[PDB]
Amino acid sequence: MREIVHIQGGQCGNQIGAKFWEVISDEHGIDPTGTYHNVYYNEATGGRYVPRAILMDLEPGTMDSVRAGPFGQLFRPDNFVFGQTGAGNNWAKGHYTEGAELIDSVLDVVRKEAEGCDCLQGFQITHSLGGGTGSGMGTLLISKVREEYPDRIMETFSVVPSPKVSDTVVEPYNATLSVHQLVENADECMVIDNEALYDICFRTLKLTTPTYGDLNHLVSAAMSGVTCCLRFPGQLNSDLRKLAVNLIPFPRLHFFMIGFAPLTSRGSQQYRALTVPELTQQMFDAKNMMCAADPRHGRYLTASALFRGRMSTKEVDEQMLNVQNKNSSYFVEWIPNNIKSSICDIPPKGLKMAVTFVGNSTAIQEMFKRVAEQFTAMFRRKAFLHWYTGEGMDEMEFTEAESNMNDLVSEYQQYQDATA
């Protein structure tokens, strides 16, 4: 009932999906041999469990990254759409030249895993917006499936280009050429940026050596928490469509912010006091989230708080009302009680309470400027443009896309400071 499929693309997407499957197996208690020790997994002969996740990528090397790691034996070999070349940081490869060669097979496999269900609650993808493979392939796939099932929602835990600490040089091109479509045919485009992830890992946990595994662990835990009000009972349950109804006023402001709690280092944990007020105060701060857009620089059009554990619902709701009345300026007024709550009845494994914050705020607009501004300084000289120009693109396909991006961000402004 209300099942989900899990498409993954690109190296970042596939690694984060691996981490998320380890975390899900940790919660539901499934050791890597796929035995117990229907929302996500599927049964197979002998009581075996196989996750309904299709893994796609252009370069085959990532196989040795998803099969080698622990819990990598849960997947099924028939769910691996692995090409042979690797789009190699080029968008047009995964969308016009190579994309349309594996898109057919991945469409076949996702349809096979979709018809095997009865109530397809929706899709959720994991990929990046900067890498050519991830961006291109996932964008073409999202396009075709929103053309296929126009009724089911499709969340994307898609990371974004890091604001300051960049690792590629063709980033803004891919970022814009994928946003131009994710603004059109997506519903919950949860955005994550490596800079804010390092900020959390360096200021909220005081860690010392963050490997990509740790950032992936954090984002995967948040991924689990955002939908872990569905797999379990709830004093006030919820699901994906409840979020989709309570979190987007207008059909194009659907890029959210993600935060998790609690998070403590060795000493802090040895001293911290875990109570609903403290979790609330830690949750609605600035650098407890995964988006380098300081929320005080904007206002939350709306924001859901998914609590988990055994708490006092009156404390939760009174805390929501109190934090809305306290920082009344940082919120928006033309939507009263703009904060939403939801409560599950079971915490994560190894904890006793934990909250997941999902905020549709107008603060992310700053991001959609800076990266966009990058494009403006790399397209006004045709820098690196001959590559995409050679594979079949056109200048209009760029410019209008940019404008669309502009349009999108302007929308926030146009209906951020409005009232009656």
């Binding site: 190296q11 370069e59 085959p60 090397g61 042979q84 070349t85 690797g86 190699g88 940081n89 080029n90 050519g132 300051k164 600490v165 960049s166 690792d167 590629t168 040089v169 063709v170 980033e171 803004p172 390092y198 050596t209 963050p210 490997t211 990509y212 990058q374 300084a377 790399m378 006004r380 000289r381 045709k382 820098a383 690196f384 001959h386 590559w387």
Partner: protein
């Protein structure tokens, strides 16, 4: 499903390739005689016991090919890949590109076709050659032309040893080095400028030796090539295929002339008294006294930098040190390319060649920079060219072999335009 062809032409190309195959056969546990007591890129299973390297060695003077056939690795190669001519190059162009090179180019193309059929997941070529010579330019130009009109999509990786400002081993090297540009632009994708005087000084100060030799130069170039291909050959938290180069370093396919840099080049005793963490190593990587080309980037700008960190290196330190180095004031980027550093990581350290002077260290960084200062080098060379062609020096040795003299100025025409194109991309908008 990954492999690269390594064509070695000329004289310097074949020696640096000999050293490169030494390093490769070393780090993969391969024994130099071919047997074995992660290699599908360079070497390959032959069908009976041994392993053969993907390489063809063209040359006209049989001395170096004979030295390879009677050196240490005589059983390694395949006795067909060693194509040996009958005459010499005499340090001109038409005798390796118009008259005699045509006697060997077809056999070369047949051998290269065989090597291509024997492979499945092709990724590119690695040609090594001097240009200050006679066959490394002529036969190299002809082979580049034949490949570009024969294969097409596969990108070529030229490694050209140019003449340095002061040190000189031939008086007619400006002529043929200018002659080779008429074909380096059109057919070649990536050209990595390597001089010698810079490598001489590098071996002098860092490695503390005072009697360096061509073998040491070749060892260091082999090290850089191995660090280049580690991403294909081995593991890494952030792998970098050979298409990331073309999609990250080539703004316009007419300006693609990169220059190298490597670290840490330290002797034994000078690492004992040295911390050498990631921050220090990425500070040293940019020091123009460590570049592998005679050029002072202080008088130029940077377009892009592919940095590959091999060895036990965490990514966050790389990101922080990148932020610092980009924040410095004396190393300025162009405005039309604000984000420039393309960084990749591999979890394997360097593998020192036995009997070398370099010290083995847990970490290493190889930088390949597409910059705009290298342009002045070309300008300098033209200067030399003019001071000869103003008096029609040595034109007879070229016109004697059908070379229509009208090409010469044309080269100094085309190359000249090239410089203006750099003057077109240093324009701060």
């Amino acid at each position: 499903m990954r492999e690269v062809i390594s064509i070695h032409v000329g004289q310097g190309g074949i020696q640096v390739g000999n050293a490169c195959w030494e390093l490769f056969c070393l780090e993969h546990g391969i024994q130099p005689d071919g047997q074995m007591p992660a290699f599908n890129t360079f070497f390959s299973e032959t069908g009976a016991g041994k392993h053969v390297p993907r390489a063809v060695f063209l040359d006209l003077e049989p001395t170096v090919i004979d030295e390879v056939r009677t050196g240490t690795y005589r059983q390694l190669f395949h006795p067909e890949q060693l194509i040996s001519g009958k005459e010499d190059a005499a340090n001109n162009f038409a005798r390796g590109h118009y008259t005699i090179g045509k006697e060997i180019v077809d056999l070369c193309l047949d051998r290269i076709r065989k090597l291509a059929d024997n492979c499945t997941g092709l990724q590119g070529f690695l040609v090594f050659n001097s240009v200050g010579g006679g066959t490394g330019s002529g036969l190299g130009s002809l082979l580049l032309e034949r490949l570009s009109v024969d294969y097409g999509k596969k990108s070529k990786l030229g490694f050209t040893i140019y003449p340095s400002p002061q040190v000189s081993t031939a008086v007619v090297e400006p002529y043929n080095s200018i002659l080779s540009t008429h074909s380096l632009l059109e057919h070649t994708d990536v050209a990595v400028m390597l001089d010698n005087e810079a490598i001489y000084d590098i071996c002098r100060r860092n490695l503390d030796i005072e009697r360096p030799t061509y073998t040491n130069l070749n060892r260091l170039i082999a090290q850089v090539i191995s660090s280049l291909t580690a991403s294909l050959r081995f593991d890494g938290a952030l792998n970098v295929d050979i298409t990331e180069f073309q999609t990250n370093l080539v703004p316009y396919p007419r300006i693609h002339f990169m220059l190298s840099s490597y670290a840490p080049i330290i002797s034994a005793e000078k690492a004992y008294h040295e911390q050498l963490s990631v921050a220090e190593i990425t500070n040293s990587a940019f020091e123009p006294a460590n570049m592998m080309a005679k050029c002072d980037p202080r008088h130029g700008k940077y377009m892009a930098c592919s940095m590959m960190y091999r060895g036990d290196v965490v990514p966050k330190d790389v990101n922080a040190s990148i932020a610092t180095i980009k924040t410095k004031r004396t190393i300025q980027f162009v405005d039309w390319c604000p984000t420039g550093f393309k960084v990749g990581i591999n979890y394997q350290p360097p593998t020192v060649v036995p009997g070398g002077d370099l010290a083995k260290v847990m970490r290493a960084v190889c930088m390949i920079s597409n910059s705009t200062a290298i342009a002045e080098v070309f300008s300098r060379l033209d200067h030399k060219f003019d001071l000869m062609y103003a008096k029609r020096a040595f034109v007879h040795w070229y016109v004697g072999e059908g070379m229509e003299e009208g090409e010469f100025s044309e080269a100094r025409e085309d190359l000249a335009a090239l410089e203006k194109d750099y003057e077109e991309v240093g324009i701060e908008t």
